[model samples]
Target: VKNSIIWFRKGLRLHDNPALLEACKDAKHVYPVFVLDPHFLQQKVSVNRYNFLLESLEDLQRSFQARGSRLLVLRGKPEEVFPRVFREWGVTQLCFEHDTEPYAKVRDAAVRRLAAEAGVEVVTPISHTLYDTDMLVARNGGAAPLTMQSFTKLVDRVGDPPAPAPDPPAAMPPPAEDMPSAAPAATGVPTWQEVGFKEPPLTVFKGGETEALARLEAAFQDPKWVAGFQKPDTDPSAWEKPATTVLSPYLKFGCLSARLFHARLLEVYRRHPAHSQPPVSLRGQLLWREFFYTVGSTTPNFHRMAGNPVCKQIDWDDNPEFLAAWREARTGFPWIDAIMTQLVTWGWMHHLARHSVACFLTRGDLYVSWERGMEVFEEHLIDQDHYLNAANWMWLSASAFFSQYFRVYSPVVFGKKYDPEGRFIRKFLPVLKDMPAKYIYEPWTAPLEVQRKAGCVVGRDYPAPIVDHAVASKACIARMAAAYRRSK
Candidate 1:
């Protein structure tokens, strides 16, 4: 039988990895490999997220070592690096889980072509999701799902993911002797200087398979789990602490398989049958992540253009000043600034913050493209997925494909509602902290003497209102109206 190599990208765990199982079945010896793609690190990923990834890799290596197998670490692009490994090990077959993101699809296509040229077989299994993409489309009958409820019904029909495959026996052969020699000087474990990232000041987010499982255990078993898991969509800080399962970083790194989380969450649901809640609502956000992958897999241009052609013609100012203010979190709107500050400080923001900030950028400021907003998100979010990030940004920017029409989150109303009593804003915006609660959401409305008394100065201490929000809101509505008119 041929020697098989399983190239690990995001799929980092041993359970429910179809490609690994398939490889084990076909090959006499198998190599499990993870590459530190220089391009991925250098360009798209944030330092906080990279650190989480490193932790996950370290844990994965330990898991393999315990089982007498090893996860070989390499540094380089996959297309260039894989061929060398294939030739060196005399590998006759290649296997991995498929990736649906645009860049990954292109990269995989190139690597598959190269492997074919070397007369080697290449195999890929769907490892990233619970519901298969093709199955979802077929069940939905090709017309795209517009709402989470509609899409989720299709997901419920698929039922729970088949239980995760049993853990492989601990007697698999060790990785090849020369595997470490092929590793880059950095050895897929980067130092602060090596990765060119400044030492982040906030709390560290750890990664790896062992830590991932540990975190899952703690979250599920914590005495507060009952209270925390009862209502995930509520304020994340509502429970004893940030209540939502902090499993996202692990999921993003693939240290913990979605299938594992799926199985465990079902156990949680089954235990509590008092309410007839759907087993899917708790993991709704992750499913949203899958939804984006499905869209990207089907329509590549959806990232750049919404499915609604009408929203395409929306006219907007290409104002660099506005863009810079928004990017820097100095837009003079406390609601937008507060959320952006969380992103910069914690490498995450509440999910509600995402909708609020996105609407402020597109509907509040009349920005034409969601591209700028996405770049800002990419710079911080540890859970950022390319398809989900870009797609949501576009969804907020254009009133297309299940766009939110009414209850436009007034920046002032949002600041007041979510940050009621202005505590959240005070925590982030020190300059506005001492202002009366009444003026906290609208500091510009304060009298000059009141501003002085509070030691706040609009346009100096903070910033002048970028444009009267009322005026900007009107301008945005007019732009949307014109786009709608032109579409018809």
Candidate 2:
């Protein structure tokens, strides 16, 4: 076989990488390339997100070096970079894992066309999702399984996901030498500043295959936690350490293989025999990701609202003032503000924490568009997926997937219910730390003497309640009811 290029996108790990495994099998030279596309840069994702990617690439380069090959970090669009790479390095074949999204489909089609014109054999294997998503839709008779009960039935009919492929060979093919003309090719991974961002103050999630595998193994050690895990019961107020397995960021980047994770989950499920069932268990969480992936793949305009047939065409309010407060963490509701603070600081949030914030942004309190909130999460979250993020936002907003528009997450009582001592509030919003537990959830309700003693005033120190939750939420519910009546 001639020189082959393993184009690395979402699938970043050495293990369970079908594309890398295939390239190593038949190729004389295997060039592992990670193209730094300007598309992501143009969007200006935050410092923490940029750092996570850089760290992952750095770890990947180390793996490649250990295996006797090197990762070629190329810069530019795939179209401009690949042709020069093919002609110069004499690349005869290309392999990559499939990416399922609206933009990705267009980009991949164009790249495949270019490769075909150059007489390069292109191989794309599906690994990003549990099942090949398009085929899943085909199996369901040309429609997305709209609900989890239906989806689970479909999963049983189709059978389990394929077992993970083995890791790349211990000692493998080396990169070609004397590649002089490829500008910025074969260079090492760059830092955040190099990619147009300041160095982050701190990073919580260490990005790499090494860390992800270790985390997966460590979590598996306690069969008790694994057996009893239920998503709804997990703490929403958790800050530095969340109650649930924070494996989403790893799974999103494809550092941890979904099939491998599923197999390990099977081991636990088999041994326990009475573990939590679907839509609640750990396996259920993975299925949710698979669920969103399937829906996003088949549905037209999955991201937007107007032309998206499934998205309820709610005439959402266009209040820039409310949206700005929500995004900037000045919502004056300590729970919502604390959640927003954690998102900006760590680039991670517990799912229920996300639920609290998303609800407040839409039908729960302020009726700003879910699309606006999705964009903010897209820029901040390390675990951001186009499918999952949009789907969850729609669910929380009661705009499409979920129908409960009246059950509001009280910004005060909801937090107080779980965390009465206000340890959760103190973690992120330390300005309210000295306030007494009785008034911490509603700092504005504190008397003048209480405020003076607590060392933080409602408006002067933190912020006054931006809007009366009682008034705003009631109005929002009425608006939602009317909106539904009119739309139908």
Candidate 3:
């Protein structure tokens, strides 16, 4: 190739990057690049998650320097930016890993169309997932496998992923010495203010492939822990040391390769054949991530409630007051408020913690739309995946993939089940630390004398519970039933 631009999208790491490998096949000059779009720059990605991405980019830049190449950083709408990149650099080839997110499906096509017009050969190998999701949808009779059993059967039939590839050589082609005026080396790393969170959020897990592997090492350190891995069993209450692997953020940002992660899991499974199986196991957790993509790739309006084949068309209340309380951690129920606070502060939480809050926000109490809660998650969560977030919101809301609107989450009892001592609650919601364990989940119920001693008085230090959980539960179930019956 005369020259090439390896566009780093999801495959942020050096290893197992088929698209990056393809870019270097025969290039005189190769520019490793990341194009920042406004959607991600401003709204889609928020503080803590954005910080993680910056570090991953910075980490990749150092690797680029060692390989005798320059990792180009540019910002603009991809459609607008790619045009300048194509002509200015005289780029003959463009390469990037295939992104399956609905937004990417359109943007990638737009850029690919632009490249074709410019006589640039575009190469995109599917490595973001183990197998091609579009093909997986086709494999399932041109429809998505809707259940775990069906999805597992389909993947079992299809078989394993392409083996992970080796990292590029010590010395690859460098960037062209002469730079384009339009595309100068916008190389300075962003300050905290630039990211806009400059947030009060916590980031215990560092970003990058280096950090990804380090976390994977610590997370998968025990083969028994590996083999016996069960997502449901993992403690949601342990904040100091997370009960589950935080490797999710890296994986979400593309610093970690899913195929490589899957390969490692198999090593443990073989060593410990008595391991747990799918829907709850480590393999199930990865498969669940896959399920979201597989269906998302084929399903229409997978993000919204209207015109969705699977999502129920319920008339969710447009209650901004209720939603605000839930998001701002003023919901009065210590459990719900504490979980939301953890998410806002740290950008990560156990799946169970997420389930409780999501349920409370939608079907369980507020009678709100899952979309509202999903948007808040899209804003704050570090582990937020485009398709996965929507699917979970849909499930938790009983909007799709689940039909148990009658089976609601009891906010007080649910939190109590996971954290009887209020350990999780105390850590995130420090105001309620002194509340008695029996009253921890519902501090509003504590007697006046008890509240005084606890250093927190209901409706004084904390707002009274936002809604009556029992009344909300009954009303929500009835409304959900009416919505579904009307479908007939």
Candidate 4:
């Protein structure tokens, strides 16, 4: 009997995994494999992201073992690695979930061509996103849905998203006991050291499908939380239990299925009559993710402004000094510094917190290039999806997707509005723990007596404001206006 290989990429879970289910159904033996690409490893990945992936792999390994099979962990490019495995194992079928990211499209095409040349059959199912991204574009007359309204219209025409698939069977076919003499020895999941990274400090978030499912269940337990949920109303300052469901990391890795989340959320909304609807509701959050993926998949050079058709080519500042300060959380702005500190330490931040820092880095204050900020986020954010990261950076920078360049977030006023007591500031920036509520957002403006009483001197304990916000913001608006006119 012929064997099938499930090439696991983003879809890490057994539940709602079409590729895994297809492999078991079609072949006498099913081999689940995950390839560790050298190209990805060479990139500057954060320790937090690395560790989370390791933990998730370990969890998946355990799941496979429970079903009388083992996960084949290989190290190399898929093009070189899969060919050898297919030949050694007598693989007649290759299956994987479809990916829409630009690099993924090219890589998958290469693999498909290899499969065809080898006379092996390939089965790819649309699972990562709610709908096929290509299909969405086709329905939109060869253009991606530029806004959420347009995206929703396309969704209505397409009918409901596919229902989540059921979990894999409790027992499955075992691998051939004997290995090929020339085949490489099967190794377990790699350690942080083996993967060329040091162990990072423990983060509050854990990885794996088990953890992801538990979080999803908890989020749905409270009907009101789902019914009244609004992304903007969530407090970014509340680190203890973030106002929003901290599910993006899970969603990014496909540890939790987006379809499952959407279906469950819709069920909740129906039960609670007055629940908020799309664009601002709990369901709206998922749609926003969909919107970014659609836009990014269709647009070339979506990540950068230089050649991107949609991005406005503003002459951004190239000051390394300012960029370094922003990266290091020493920008002398307490609100900005605290958020940056959370990003570096935790590898995640709240959505609005992301907005404030992103705006500050680009149009609001620093006037640095969005590309620079995107690179930093790519390296650091544990939940960073390529499409979402690039699209949101453009949105925050007022480059594409969003165009409100004049409405800059006041680094001081914005944070204070959500966290009037300065609790969020003191948690991350402990030097200002004793500062009064009024000066917590702007410690540099505090009087000498207040600074002394708070035991935090502006210059010594924390650097003073790097640049005057009011002056810089006005200058930035004028520049944006000029750039907008020029682009038109």
Pick by TM-score: which candidate is best? 2
- What candidate 4 gets wrong by more than 4 Å, as runs, is 38-43, 180-185
What does candidate 4 score on TM? 0.97
Q: What clash count goes with each model?
A: 6, 0, 1, 0
lDDT of each: 0.71, 0.87, 0.85, 0.87
Candidate 4 lDDT over 1-488, as tens digits, reads 76988988899889899998888985688888888864566656887887788788888988988988888777788899878878888889999999988889999999999998887899999999998888889988989878889898888899889999998999988677676522336446877777676565456788889999999999988989899998887888889888888999999999999999999988887788999977889888998998898888888998888889888899899989889999999998899999999998888899999999999999999999998999999888889899999999988999987898988999999988778988888999999999999889888889999999989998899998889999999999998999899987
Model 1 spans with C-alpha error above 4 angstroms: 24-29, 39-45, 183-188, 199-204, 222-233, 236-240, 274-280, 306-312, 447-455
Note the residue pairs that clash in candidate 4: none
Task: Give per-residue lDDT, candidate 2, residue 440.
Answer: 90
Estimate, for each residue in 95-146, the C-alpha lDDT of model 3 and write its tens digit: 9998877788899999999999999998888888878888888888988899
TM-scores, all models, native as reference = 0.87, 0.97, 0.96, 0.97
**Rank by lDDT, descending?**
4, 2, 3, 1
What's the lDDT of the predicted structure labeled candidate 3? 0.85
lDDT of 1 at 277: 45
Q: Please, what are the lDDT tens digits per residue for candidate 1 over residues 302-416?
A: 5565453323646656777787887788888787787778777667766667778888787665463677778778878887777777777767776455444433567777657
- For residues 67-117, write the lDDT of model 2, one tens digit per residue: 887777887888888888888888898999999888888989999999998
